[PDB]
Design a protein around this ligand. Structure first.
Ligand SMILES: [Cl-]
Lengths: 88, 167
């Protein structure tokens, strides 16, 4: 039997296209966007869904001062909350 | 990886307030989660992305800790990235997985993500539109109904995205 399906569904993109060129002092520095994504993923994967963790990432980046980032959530076709349920 | 774990009471505290508004997850014993990292550090004619080794270490480790077998591919052309994404879409582990993560890290422009052979004169670009197409329901039926998280680090070569204002 045949059923109908959306061709594009259940996507979420999270992008930083805010300029991020290499630092003069300590060039082997990790991207702050990635570092901050990881810190929020580590802390909030248990309690928040990804759509929310991406917001929390943004909220933490609200005030520019050093390395200024404002990453967008894009192309969202999520129909449900995606909870990572760490260790389940 | 220091991922704060989810307790059983806290898990069902989540499962209760929002019922059928949460993506189902497969059992830990027999799920085969996959995640793909493509990271371009060395380029033909555009600046070396140093400290990407730290971004790879970080993301792999994290994704691994969320239960994903992580592939890591380095310094690819847009044609190579496309092919690599095609292979990933037809991996059978997806049929027995509940989700996936894609991570791209490179130099960005208007069109999208820079390949290694890229130059402003002879462009080598993979476009975001193409990433989604290879992972959609049609061209990837195994991941259908399952969350696909794409994470892109595509810094555009512009002036800082900040402005000064009088307060
Ligand atoms: Cl610097």
């Amino acid at each position: 039997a045949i059923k109908k399906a959306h061709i594009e569904k259940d996507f979420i993109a999270f992008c930083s296209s805010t300029p991020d060129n290499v630092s003069w002092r300590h060039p082997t520095m990790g991207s702050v966007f990635i570092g901050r994504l990881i810190e929020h993923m580590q802390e909030y994967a248990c309690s928040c869904d990804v759509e929310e963790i991406f917001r929390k990432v943004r909220f933490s980046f609200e005030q520019p001062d050093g390395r200024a980032q404002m990453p967008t959530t894009e192309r969202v076709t999520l129909t449900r909350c995606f909870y990572l349920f760490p260790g389940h | 990886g220091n991922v704060k774990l989810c307790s059983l009471e806290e898990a069902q505290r989540i499962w209760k307030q929002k019922s059928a508004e949460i993506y189902p997850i497969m059992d830990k014993s027999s799920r085969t989660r996959l995640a793909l990292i493509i990271c371009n550090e060395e380029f033909d004619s555009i600046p070396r992305r140093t400290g990407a080794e730290v971004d790879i270490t970080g993301m792999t480790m994290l994704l691994q800790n969320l239960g994903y077998s992580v592939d890591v591919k380095k310094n690819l052309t847009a044609s190579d990235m496309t092919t690599e994404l095609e292979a990933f879409a037809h991996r059978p582990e997806h049929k027995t997985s509940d989700s996936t993560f894609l991570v791209f890290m490179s130099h960005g422009i208007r069109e999208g993500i820079c390949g290694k052979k890229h130059s402003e004169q002879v462009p080598d670009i993979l476009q975001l539109n193409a990433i989604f197409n290879m992972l959609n329901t049609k061209n990837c039926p195994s991941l259908k109904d399952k969350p696909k998280v794409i994470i892109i680090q595509a810094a555009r070569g512009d002036s800082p995205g900040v402005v000064w204002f009088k307060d």
